[PDB]
Coordinates of C-alpha atoms in Angstrom, one line a residue:
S5 CA 0.0 0.0 0.0
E6 CA 1.7 3.1 -1.3
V7 CA -0.7 5.7 0.2
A8 CA -0.3 4.0 3.6
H9 CA 3.5 3.9 3.4
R10 CA 3.5 7.6 2.6
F11 CA 1.1 8.6 5.3
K12 CA 3.3 6.9 7.9
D13 CA 6.6 8.5 6.6
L14 CA 5.3 12.0 6.3
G15 CA 2.8 12.1 9.2
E16 CA -0.7 13.4 8.8
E17 CA -0.3 17.2 8.6
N18 CA 2.3 17.2 5.8
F19 CA 0.4 14.4 4.0
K20 CA -2.8 16.5 4.1
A21 CA -1.0 19.7 3.0
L22 CA 0.8 18.0 0.1
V23 CA -2.3 16.3 -1.3
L24 CA -4.0 19.7 -1.3
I25 CA -1.1 21.1 -3.2
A26 CA -1.1 18.3 -5.7
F27 CA -4.8 19.0 -6.3
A28 CA -4.5 22.7 -6.7
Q29 CA -1.6 22.4 -9.1
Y30 CA -3.5 20.0 -11.4
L31 CA -6.8 21.8 -11.3
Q32 CA -6.1 25.5 -10.8
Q33 CA -9.6 26.7 -11.5
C34 CA -11.4 24.5 -9.0
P35 CA -12.8 26.3 -5.9
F36 CA -11.1 25.8 -2.5
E37 CA -14.1 24.0 -0.9
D38 CA -14.1 21.3 -3.6
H39 CA -10.4 20.6 -3.3
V40 CA -10.8 20.5 0.5
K41 CA -13.5 17.8 0.2
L42 CA -11.3 15.7 -2.1
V43 CA -8.4 16.0 0.2
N44 CA -10.3 15.0 3.3
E45 CA -11.8 12.0 1.4
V46 CA -8.3 10.9 0.5
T47 CA -7.0 11.4 4.0
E48 CA -9.8 9.2 5.4
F49 CA -9.1 6.5 2.9
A50 CA -5.3 6.8 3.7
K51 CA -6.1 6.0 7.3
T52 CA -8.1 2.9 6.5
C53 CA -4.9 1.8 4.7
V54 CA -2.6 2.5 7.6
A55 CA -5.1 0.4 9.6
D56 CA -5.1 -2.4 7.0
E57 CA -2.6 -2.3 4.1
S58 CA -4.4 -5.3 2.5
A59 CA -7.8 -3.5 2.7
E60 CA -9.7 -3.1 -0.5
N61 CA -8.3 -0.3 -2.8
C62 CA -5.2 0.3 -0.8
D63 CA -2.7 -1.3 -3.2
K64 CA -3.7 1.2 -5.8
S65 CA -1.1 3.7 -7.2
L66 CA -1.1 7.3 -6.0
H67 CA -1.7 8.4 -9.5
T68 CA -4.7 6.3 -9.8
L69 CA -6.1 7.2 -6.4
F70 CA -5.4 10.9 -6.9
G71 CA -6.6 10.9 -10.5
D72 CA -9.8 9.1 -9.7
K73 CA -10.5 11.8 -7.1
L74 CA -9.8 14.6 -9.6
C75 CA -12.2 13.1 -12.2
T76 CA -15.2 13.2 -9.9
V77 CA -15.3 17.0 -10.1
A78 CA -13.7 17.5 -13.6
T79 CA -16.6 16.9 -16.0
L80 CA -17.4 20.6 -15.7
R81 CA -15.9 22.1 -18.9
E82 CA -17.7 25.4 -18.5
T83 CA -15.2 26.0 -15.7
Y84 CA -12.2 23.9 -16.8
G85 CA -12.4 22.7 -20.4
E86 CA -10.3 19.8 -21.6
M87 CA -9.6 18.0 -18.3
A88 CA -12.7 15.7 -18.9
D89 CA -10.6 14.4 -21.8
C90 CA -7.8 13.6 -19.3
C91 CA -10.4 11.6 -17.4
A92 CA -11.2 9.3 -20.4
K93 CA -7.7 8.0 -20.2
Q94 CA -6.0 5.1 -18.4
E95 CA -3.0 5.8 -16.2
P96 CA -0.3 7.0 -16.8
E97 CA -1.9 8.7 -19.8
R98 CA -4.4 10.5 -17.6
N99 CA -1.5 11.7 -15.3
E100 CA 0.6 13.0 -18.2
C101 CA -2.5 14.7 -19.7
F102 CA -3.0 16.6 -16.3
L103 CA 0.6 17.7 -15.9
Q104 CA 0.4 18.8 -19.6
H105 CA -2.4 21.2 -18.8
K106 CA -0.5 23.0 -16.0
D107 CA -0.9 26.7 -16.7
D108 CA 2.2 28.7 -15.9
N109 CA 0.2 31.9 -16.2
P110 CA -3.4 31.1 -15.1
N111 CA -6.4 33.4 -15.8
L112 CA -6.7 34.3 -12.1
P113 CA -8.2 37.3 -10.3
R114 CA -5.4 38.8 -8.2
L115 CA -5.9 38.3 -4.5
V116 CA -6.7 41.5 -2.7
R117 CA -5.3 41.0 0.8
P118 CA -7.6 42.1 3.7
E119 CA -6.7 44.5 6.4
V120 CA -4.4 43.2 9.2
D121 CA -7.3 43.4 11.6
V122 CA -9.4 41.2 9.4
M123 CA -6.7 38.7 8.5
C124 CA -5.7 38.4 12.2
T125 CA -9.4 37.7 13.2
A126 CA -9.7 35.1 10.4
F127 CA -6.5 33.5 11.7
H128 CA -8.1 33.2 15.1
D129 CA -11.5 32.2 13.8
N130 CA -10.2 29.1 12.0
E131 CA -6.4 28.6 12.0
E132 CA -6.5 25.5 9.8
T133 CA -8.8 26.8 7.1
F134 CA -6.8 30.0 7.0
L135 CA -3.6 28.1 6.4
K136 CA -5.1 25.7 3.8
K137 CA -6.3 28.8 2.0
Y138 CA -2.7 30.1 1.9
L139 CA -1.5 26.8 0.4
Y140 CA -4.3 26.7 -2.1
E141 CA -3.7 30.2 -3.5
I142 CA 0.0 29.9 -3.9
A143 CA -0.1 26.4 -5.5
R144 CA -2.7 27.2 -8.1
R145 CA -0.8 30.3 -9.1
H146 CA 2.4 28.3 -9.1
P147 CA 1.7 24.9 -10.5
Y148 CA 5.3 23.8 -10.3
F149 CA 6.1 25.3 -6.8
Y150 CA 8.6 23.0 -5.1
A151 CA 6.1 21.3 -2.7
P152 CA 8.2 20.5 0.4
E153 CA 9.5 24.1 0.2
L154 CA 5.9 25.3 0.1
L155 CA 5.3 23.4 3.5
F156 CA 8.2 25.5 4.8
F157 CA 6.7 28.8 3.6
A158 CA 3.3 27.9 5.1
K159 CA 5.0 27.1 8.4
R160 CA 6.6 30.5 8.4
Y161 CA 3.3 32.2 7.3
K162 CA 1.7 30.6 10.4
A163 CA 4.5 31.8 12.6
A164 CA 4.2 35.3 11.2
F165 CA 0.5 35.4 12.2
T166 CA 1.2 33.7 15.5
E167 CA 3.7 36.3 16.6
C168 CA 2.3 39.5 15.0
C169 CA -1.4 39.1 15.9
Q170 CA -0.2 39.5 19.5
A171 CA 1.9 42.6 18.7
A172 CA 1.1 46.0 20.0
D173 CA 1.5 47.3 16.4
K174 CA 0.2 44.4 14.4
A175 CA 0.6 46.0 11.0
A176 CA 4.1 47.1 11.5
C177 CA 5.1 43.7 12.6
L178 CA 3.0 41.7 10.1
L179 CA 3.4 43.4 6.7
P180 CA 7.2 43.3 6.4
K181 CA 7.1 39.6 7.1
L182 CA 4.3 38.9 4.5
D183 CA 6.1 41.1 1.9
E184 CA 9.3 39.0 2.5
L185 CA 7.6 35.6 2.3
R186 CA 5.9 36.8 -0.9
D187 CA 9.2 37.9 -2.5
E188 CA 10.9 34.7 -1.4
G189 CA 8.0 32.7 -2.8
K190 CA 8.2 34.0 -6.3
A191 CA 12.0 33.5 -6.4
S192 CA 11.7 29.9 -5.1
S193 CA 9.0 29.3 -7.7
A194 CA 11.0 30.6 -10.6
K195 CA 14.1 28.7 -9.3
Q196 CA 12.2 25.4 -9.2
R197 CA 10.5 26.1 -12.5
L198 CA 13.9 26.0 -14.2
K199 CA 14.6 22.6 -12.6
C200 CA 11.4 21.2 -14.0
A201 CA 11.9 22.7 -17.4
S202 CA 15.4 21.2 -17.5
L203 CA 14.1 17.8 -16.6
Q204 CA 11.1 17.9 -18.9
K205 CA 12.6 19.5 -22.0
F206 CA 16.3 18.4 -21.8
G207 CA 16.1 15.1 -19.9
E208 CA 17.6 13.5 -16.8
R209 CA 21.1 13.7 -18.2
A210 CA 20.9 17.5 -18.3
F211 CA 19.6 17.8 -14.8
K212 CA 22.2 15.4 -13.4
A213 CA 25.0 17.4 -15.0
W214 CA 23.6 20.6 -13.5
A215 CA 23.6 18.9 -10.1
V216 CA 27.1 17.6 -10.5
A217 CA 28.3 21.1 -11.2
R218 CA 26.4 22.9 -8.4
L219 CA 27.0 20.3 -5.7
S220 CA 30.7 20.0 -6.5
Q221 CA 31.1 23.7 -6.2
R222 CA 29.1 23.6 -2.9
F223 CA 30.8 20.6 -1.4
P224 CA 34.3 20.9 -2.8
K225 CA 35.8 18.5 -0.2
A226 CA 33.6 15.6 -1.0
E227 CA 34.9 12.7 -3.1
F228 CA 33.4 12.0 -6.5
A229 CA 31.5 9.0 -5.2
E230 CA 29.9 11.0 -2.4
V231 CA 28.9 13.7 -4.8
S232 CA 27.5 11.1 -7.2
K233 CA 25.4 9.5 -4.6
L234 CA 24.0 13.0 -3.7
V235 CA 23.3 13.8 -7.3
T236 CA 21.3 10.6 -7.8
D237 CA 19.3 11.3 -4.7
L238 CA 18.6 14.9 -5.6
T239 CA 17.7 13.9 -9.2
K240 CA 15.1 11.4 -7.9
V241 CA 13.7 14.1 -5.6
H242 CA 13.3 16.7 -8.4
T243 CA 12.1 14.1 -10.9
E244 CA 9.3 13.2 -8.6
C245 CA 8.2 16.7 -7.6
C246 CA 8.3 17.8 -11.3
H247 CA 6.1 14.9 -12.4
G248 CA 3.6 15.7 -9.6
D249 CA 4.7 12.8 -7.4
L250 CA 4.6 15.2 -4.4
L251 CA 4.2 12.6 -1.6
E252 CA 7.3 10.6 -2.7
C253 CA 9.2 13.9 -3.4
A254 CA 8.8 15.3 0.1
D255 CA 9.6 11.9 1.7
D256 CA 12.8 11.4 -0.4
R257 CA 13.9 15.0 0.3
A258 CA 13.6 14.3 4.0
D259 CA 15.6 11.1 3.6
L260 CA 18.2 13.1 1.7
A261 CA 18.7 15.8 4.3
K262 CA 18.9 13.0 6.9
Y263 CA 21.7 11.4 5.0
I264 CA 23.5 14.6 4.5
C265 CA 23.3 15.6 8.2
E266 CA 24.7 12.2 9.2
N267 CA 27.6 12.4 6.9
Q268 CA 28.8 16.0 7.3
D269 CA 32.4 14.9 7.6
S270 CA 32.4 13.6 4.0
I271 CA 30.3 16.4 2.6
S272 CA 30.9 19.9 4.0
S273 CA 31.8 21.8 7.1
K274 CA 29.2 24.5 6.6
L275 CA 26.3 22.2 7.6
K276 CA 26.5 22.2 11.4
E277 CA 23.9 24.9 11.9
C278 CA 21.5 23.5 9.2
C279 CA 21.5 20.1 10.6
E280 CA 20.4 21.5 14.1
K281 CA 17.2 22.8 12.7
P282 CA 13.6 21.4 12.6
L283 CA 13.0 19.1 9.6
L284 CA 11.5 21.6 7.0
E285 CA 14.0 24.2 8.0
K286 CA 16.9 21.8 7.8
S287 CA 16.1 20.9 4.1
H288 CA 15.6 24.6 3.1
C289 CA 18.8 25.4 4.9
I290 CA 20.9 22.7 3.2
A291 CA 19.7 23.6 -0.3
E292 CA 20.8 27.2 0.4
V293 CA 24.1 26.5 2.1
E294 CA 27.3 28.5 1.3
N295 CA 30.0 26.7 -0.6
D296 CA 32.6 25.0 1.5
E297 CA 36.3 25.9 1.4
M298 CA 38.3 24.3 -1.4
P299 CA 40.8 21.6 -0.4
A300 CA 44.3 23.3 -0.4
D301 CA 46.7 21.3 -2.6
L302 CA 44.5 20.6 -5.7
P303 CA 46.7 19.5 -8.6
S304 CA 46.2 20.5 -12.3
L305 CA 43.4 18.9 -14.4
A306 CA 46.0 18.7 -17.1
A307 CA 47.5 15.5 -15.7
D308 CA 44.3 13.4 -15.6
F309 CA 42.5 15.0 -18.5
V310 CA 44.9 16.2 -21.3
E311 CA 48.3 14.8 -20.6
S312 CA 47.5 11.2 -19.7
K313 CA 47.7 8.6 -22.5
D314 CA 44.8 6.7 -21.0
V315 CA 42.3 9.6 -21.6
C316 CA 40.7 7.8 -24.6
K317 CA 40.9 4.5 -22.7
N318 CA 39.2 6.0 -19.7
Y319 CA 36.7 8.0 -21.7
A320 CA 35.5 5.1 -23.9
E321 CA 35.2 2.6 -21.1
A322 CA 32.6 4.7 -19.2
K323 CA 32.0 8.1 -20.6
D324 CA 29.3 9.6 -18.5
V325 CA 31.4 8.6 -15.5
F326 CA 34.6 10.0 -17.0
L327 CA 32.9 13.2 -18.0
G328 CA 31.1 13.3 -14.6
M329 CA 34.6 13.2 -13.0
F330 CA 35.8 15.9 -15.2
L331 CA 32.9 18.2 -14.3
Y332 CA 33.3 17.4 -10.5
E333 CA 37.0 18.2 -10.7
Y334 CA 36.6 21.4 -12.7
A335 CA 33.5 22.6 -10.7
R336 CA 35.0 22.0 -7.2
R337 CA 37.9 24.2 -8.4
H338 CA 35.8 27.0 -9.7
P339 CA 33.1 28.4 -7.3
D340 CA 33.6 31.6 -9.4
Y341 CA 32.2 30.1 -12.6
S342 CA 28.4 29.9 -13.2
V343 CA 26.8 26.4 -13.4
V344 CA 25.9 27.2 -17.0
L345 CA 29.5 28.0 -17.8
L346 CA 30.8 24.9 -16.2
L347 CA 28.4 22.9 -18.3
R348 CA 29.5 24.6 -21.5
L349 CA 33.1 23.7 -20.6
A350 CA 32.1 20.1 -20.0
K351 CA 30.3 20.1 -23.4
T352 CA 33.4 21.4 -25.3
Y353 CA 35.5 18.8 -23.5
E354 CA 33.1 16.1 -24.6
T355 CA 33.0 17.2 -28.2
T356 CA 36.8 17.4 -28.6
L357 CA 37.1 14.0 -27.0
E358 CA 34.5 12.5 -29.4
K359 CA 36.5 13.8 -32.3
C360 CA 40.1 13.3 -31.3
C361 CA 39.9 9.9 -29.6
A362 CA 38.8 8.5 -33.0
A363 CA 41.7 10.3 -34.8
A364 CA 45.3 9.2 -35.7
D365 CA 47.3 10.8 -32.9
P366 CA 44.5 11.7 -30.4
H367 CA 46.9 13.0 -27.8
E368 CA 47.9 15.7 -30.2
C369 CA 44.5 17.0 -31.2
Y370 CA 43.2 17.2 -27.6
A371 CA 46.4 18.5 -26.1
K372 CA 45.0 22.0 -26.7
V373 CA 41.4 21.3 -25.3
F374 CA 41.7 23.7 -22.3
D375 CA 42.7 26.6 -24.6
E376 CA 39.2 26.5 -26.0
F377 CA 37.7 27.3 -22.6
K378 CA 38.9 30.8 -22.2
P379 CA 36.7 32.7 -24.7
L380 CA 33.8 30.8 -23.1
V381 CA 35.0 32.1 -19.7
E382 CA 35.6 35.7 -20.9
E383 CA 32.2 36.3 -22.4
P384 CA 29.9 36.1 -19.3
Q385 CA 32.5 38.1 -17.3
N386 CA 32.5 40.9 -19.8
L387 CA 28.7 41.0 -20.0
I388 CA 28.3 41.2 -16.2
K389 CA 30.9 44.0 -15.7
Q390 CA 29.4 46.2 -18.4
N391 CA 25.9 45.6 -17.1
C392 CA 26.9 46.0 -13.4
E393 CA 28.4 49.3 -14.4
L394 CA 25.2 50.4 -16.1
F395 CA 23.2 49.3 -13.0
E396 CA 25.2 51.5 -10.6
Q397 CA 24.5 54.6 -12.7
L398 CA 20.8 54.1 -13.2
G399 CA 19.8 52.2 -10.0
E400 CA 17.2 49.4 -10.1
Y401 CA 14.1 51.0 -11.5
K402 CA 15.8 52.8 -14.4
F403 CA 17.9 49.7 -15.0
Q404 CA 14.7 47.8 -15.6
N405 CA 13.6 50.5 -18.0
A406 CA 16.8 50.1 -20.1
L407 CA 16.4 46.4 -20.1
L408 CA 12.7 46.7 -21.1
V409 CA 13.8 48.7 -24.1
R410 CA 16.7 46.3 -24.9
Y411 CA 14.4 43.3 -24.8
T412 CA 11.4 44.8 -26.4
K413 CA 13.6 45.6 -29.4
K414 CA 15.2 42.1 -29.2
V415 CA 11.7 40.4 -29.5
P416 CA 8.9 42.9 -30.2
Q417 CA 6.2 40.2 -30.8
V418 CA 6.3 39.0 -27.2
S419 CA 3.3 39.9 -24.9
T420 CA 3.7 43.2 -23.1
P421 CA 2.7 41.5 -19.8
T422 CA 5.5 39.0 -20.4
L423 CA 8.0 41.6 -21.5
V424 CA 7.3 43.7 -18.3
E425 CA 7.6 40.9 -15.9
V426 CA 10.7 39.3 -17.4
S427 CA 12.5 42.7 -17.8
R428 CA 11.6 43.6 -14.2
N429 CA 13.0 40.2 -13.1
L430 CA 16.1 40.9 -15.3
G431 CA 16.6 44.2 -13.5
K432 CA 16.5 42.5 -10.1
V433 CA 19.7 40.7 -11.2
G434 CA 21.7 43.9 -10.6
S435 CA 20.4 44.4 -7.1
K436 CA 21.2 40.8 -6.1
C437 CA 24.7 40.5 -7.7
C438 CA 26.5 43.7 -8.4
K439 CA 27.0 44.0 -4.7
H440 CA 29.6 41.2 -4.9
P441 CA 33.2 41.0 -5.9
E442 CA 33.9 39.5 -9.3
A443 CA 34.5 36.0 -7.9
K444 CA 31.0 35.6 -6.5
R445 CA 29.3 37.9 -9.1
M446 CA 29.2 35.5 -12.1
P447 CA 27.7 32.4 -10.4
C448 CA 25.2 34.7 -8.7
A449 CA 24.4 36.7 -11.8
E450 CA 24.4 34.2 -14.8
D451 CA 22.6 31.5 -12.8
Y452 CA 19.9 33.9 -11.8
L453 CA 19.6 34.9 -15.5
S454 CA 19.1 31.2 -16.3
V455 CA 16.0 31.4 -14.1
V456 CA 14.6 34.6 -15.5
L457 CA 15.2 33.6 -19.2
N458 CA 13.6 30.2 -18.6
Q459 CA 10.6 32.1 -17.3
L460 CA 10.4 34.0 -20.6
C461 CA 10.6 30.6 -22.3
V462 CA 7.8 29.0 -20.2
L463 CA 5.6 32.1 -20.6
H464 CA 6.0 32.1 -24.4
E465 CA 5.7 28.4 -25.0
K466 CA 2.0 28.6 -24.6
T467 CA 1.3 31.0 -27.4
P468 CA 4.5 31.3 -29.3
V469 CA 4.7 34.5 -31.4
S470 CA 8.5 35.2 -31.6
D471 CA 10.6 32.6 -33.5
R472 CA 13.7 34.1 -31.9
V473 CA 12.3 33.2 -28.5
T474 CA 11.4 29.8 -29.6
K475 CA 14.8 29.2 -31.1
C476 CA 16.9 30.3 -28.1
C477 CA 14.6 28.3 -25.8
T478 CA 14.7 25.0 -27.8
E479 CA 18.3 24.8 -29.1
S480 CA 20.2 24.4 -25.9
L481 CA 19.5 24.8 -22.2
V482 CA 22.9 26.0 -21.3
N483 CA 23.5 28.5 -24.2
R484 CA 20.2 30.3 -23.6
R485 CA 21.7 33.3 -22.0
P486 CA 24.4 33.7 -24.7
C487 CA 21.8 33.2 -27.4
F488 CA 19.4 35.8 -26.0
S489 CA 22.3 38.2 -25.5
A490 CA 23.6 37.8 -29.1
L491 CA 20.1 38.9 -30.5
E492 CA 20.2 42.3 -32.0
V493 CA 17.4 44.6 -33.1
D494 CA 14.7 42.9 -35.1
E495 CA 14.4 44.6 -38.5
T496 CA 11.6 42.3 -39.6
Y497 CA 9.2 43.8 -37.1
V498 CA 6.5 46.3 -38.2
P499 CA 5.5 49.0 -35.6
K500 CA 1.9 49.0 -34.2
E501 CA 1.4 52.7 -35.0
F502 CA -0.6 54.1 -32.1
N503 CA -3.6 53.2 -29.9
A504 CA -4.6 56.3 -28.0
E505 CA -6.3 54.4 -25.2
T506 CA -3.0 52.5 -24.6
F507 CA -1.3 55.7 -23.7
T508 CA -4.1 57.3 -21.7
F509 CA -4.2 56.9 -17.9
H510 CA -7.1 57.1 -15.5
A511 CA -7.7 58.2 -11.9
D512 CA -7.8 54.6 -10.6
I513 CA -4.0 54.6 -11.1
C514 CA -3.8 56.8 -7.9
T515 CA -5.1 54.2 -5.5
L516 CA -2.5 51.6 -6.5
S517 CA 0.6 50.7 -4.6
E518 CA 3.7 52.6 -5.8
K519 CA 5.1 49.4 -7.3
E520 CA 1.8 48.9 -9.2
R521 CA 2.1 52.5 -10.5
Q522 CA 5.6 51.6 -11.8
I523 CA 4.4 48.5 -13.6
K524 CA 1.7 50.5 -15.3
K525 CA 4.4 52.9 -16.7
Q526 CA 6.8 50.1 -17.6
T527 CA 3.8 48.7 -19.4
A528 CA 3.3 51.9 -21.4
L529 CA 7.0 52.1 -22.2
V530 CA 6.9 48.7 -23.8
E531 CA 4.0 49.8 -25.9
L532 CA 5.8 53.0 -26.8
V533 CA 8.8 51.0 -28.0
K534 CA 6.5 48.6 -30.0
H535 CA 4.9 51.5 -31.8
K536 CA 8.2 53.3 -32.3
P537 CA 11.4 51.1 -32.2
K538 CA 14.3 51.4 -34.6
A539 CA 14.5 55.2 -34.7
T540 CA 14.3 55.9 -30.9
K541 CA 17.2 56.7 -28.6
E542 CA 17.2 58.4 -25.2
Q543 CA 14.1 60.2 -26.5
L544 CA 12.4 57.4 -24.6
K545 CA 14.1 58.1 -21.4
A546 CA 12.6 61.5 -22.0
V547 CA 8.9 60.5 -22.5
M548 CA 9.3 58.1 -19.6
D549 CA 10.1 61.0 -17.3
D550 CA 7.2 62.9 -18.9
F551 CA 4.7 60.3 -17.8
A552 CA 5.9 60.1 -14.3
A553 CA 5.5 63.9 -14.0
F554 CA 2.2 63.6 -15.8
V555 CA 0.8 61.1 -13.3
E556 CA 2.4 63.1 -10.5
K557 CA 0.4 66.3 -11.2
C558 CA -2.9 64.6 -11.9
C559 CA -3.0 62.5 -8.8
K560 CA -2.9 65.8 -6.8
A561 CA -5.1 67.8 -9.1
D562 CA -8.3 67.6 -7.0
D563 CA -9.6 66.6 -10.4
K564 CA -13.0 65.5 -11.5
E565 CA -11.5 62.7 -13.6
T566 CA -10.5 65.8 -15.5
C567 CA -6.7 66.1 -15.3
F568 CA -6.1 62.6 -16.6
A569 CA -8.6 63.0 -19.4
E570 CA -7.7 66.5 -20.6
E571 CA -4.0 65.7 -20.4
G572 CA -5.0 62.5 -22.3
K573 CA -6.5 62.9 -25.8
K574 CA -4.2 65.9 -26.2
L575 CA -1.1 64.6 -24.4
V576 CA -0.9 61.5 -26.6
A577 CA 0.1 63.2 -29.8
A578 CA 3.4 64.3 -28.1
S579 CA 4.3 60.7 -27.4
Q580 CA 3.3 60.1 -31.0
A581 CA 5.3 62.8 -32.7
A582 CA 9.0 62.2 -31.6

């Protein structure tokens, strides 16, 4: 009985929470009350199985049991659509059908958060419903959210309410915490989303290599065998979570942190604090841990990998292992390279080995292999520096503006909503990485870009419109950032003239958060560029400042809807002339 074995490993609370997450990630349009029913029904069944593993339907697969439950309230196409088609399938077709329909950008009313008062009362009224609601709204908005991490966020959301609803100034205590959890959520979500894209689009081999690189940088003292065991465990974990096997994902993740904490002397010396923490914390802590110190007397990679005569012998006899070794050795020595760079390097090395080892004197043709690495190393470095420089001068917001422009001209066919979000997330790269010295900058910066760019890819994949986006996204996981950066202005694109309603603002803009006000303007900048690319320099930085001042004056104008309207169907020709 699989559902029984998972109930006992996880315990009831986490079981309950994960099942609800599973359900809200497959059926993102279903109401909260209907998911709750399904979840409780499964939990009750799960208990009958813990009581008797040989009891009736207890030997069923989780996919079957879960999928049967989903199909009971899925023949309602006026709300959902083509999930009733999933229900006419046998497993695992039904399951793959469901995952297939996961919507990275749902059509979902934004959640207006109640006053602190109200929320605090609701938290006291019914703590459990309040917390399930939290889980439900994140998971349906984030269909690939790393589930075990989402238990960790929910635990901290509960703690935030537990502390702050007893504060003397509840709002001042509560809001900065909620705003932090929100920001950490999105970042976690995007981060995980890259892992799932890698697995689903590029295969297990690609994820494993990503893991070899990242874990070898982070645990440079570990032997190859230890790292390899860790990669296999981590792969299994993320393969399950990305395929909606959320119960087995959590359980294996808890097994993995257990293993790590018990073998700290073979892994890293940075772990001590992490392994002291409560279970969910410990796992979150380990995934986030600082790289360990590099062993002191590390020899050259030349001896093993370019000078030896056994290179071809060692390569041909077990190549994924040989190349695994190469990546481990190179990665542990370079915490200052990005994971993507390290993977490029390993790709080059593989290619030249495939060629040379089948040539006359192989030892000669591959004797120069490392020489090929340096232009690969130089390129990200030079991009960061030039962009980090630009950030310091503009600051975050204006840096976003410059990147909106750069990207709107790179790929004008892309959705405005998608261009705004991705460019905003691009701009946040400066704030997170330009702080650092140039040996911590690249892994910070280019690996974060991997995440943002993948987001552009997943948001475009639905309704592809730019062939340039489709290309960069499909050709190669690792080269995505180089490929997107190489793109120059698109001469094919025809401007969308001028919609006067697109450039006219209204009084409702005044009651929005400041950050919302910004997005509205970054939105209008994108449209400005779409309708007038090519021939437009810093005469955009001009109009951008014009709109800010425009919305400034009108929000104070004591107006009768008037200021925004009068400085509307007259103002627009100015941003139509230049």
